[PDB]
């Protein structure tokens, strides 16, 4: 057993933004990542509105159907429900806050259809 949980994204990690901010994982606002990506040029936020969410039967797998951009190009991507999706102007969420908080100790809001998910590009 370690002193605390893993330092990567697990609850209590001190996450450093591109603007230099040092904030707890659980407190990071979407605006925090927005700014960090915008202040940077090798990094960027994306606006993908989940239009549908389907369970894939597979263990903890749900495909979030996103409409990428205002041209609403739909992408059906099978993701594990324990993936915490940062949502552009919608909040710090996960497809299953229960599981994300259970396994990673990390609290999340419910990522549901309508939530414009942040796709962030690490160049």
């Amino acid at each position: 057993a370690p002193p605390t949980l893993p330092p990567y994204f697990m609850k209590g990690s001190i996450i450093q933004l591109a603007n230099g901010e040092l904030k707890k994982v659980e407190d990071l606002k979407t605006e925090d990542f927005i700014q960090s990506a915008e202040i940077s040029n090798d990094l960027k936020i994306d606006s993908s509105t989940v239009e549908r969410i389907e369970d894939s039967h597979s263990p903890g797998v749900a495909v979030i159907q996103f409409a990428v951009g205002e041209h609403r190009a739909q992408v059906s991507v099978e993701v594990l429900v324990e993936y915490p999706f940062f949502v552009f102007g919608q909040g710090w969420s996960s497809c299953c806050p229960e599981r994300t908080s259970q396994l990673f100790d990390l609290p999340c809001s419910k990522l549901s259809v309508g939530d414009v998910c942040i796709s962030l590009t690490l160049k």
């Binding site: 990567y8 996450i15 993908s48 190009a73 940062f86 962030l120």
Partner: peptide
């Protein structure tokens, strides 16, 4: 610290 891209997932390579 950890580089802030630690909890932000990608909805697969978007178009």
């Amino acid at each position: 610290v950890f580089p802030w891209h630690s909890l932000v997932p990608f909805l697969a390579p978007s178009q």
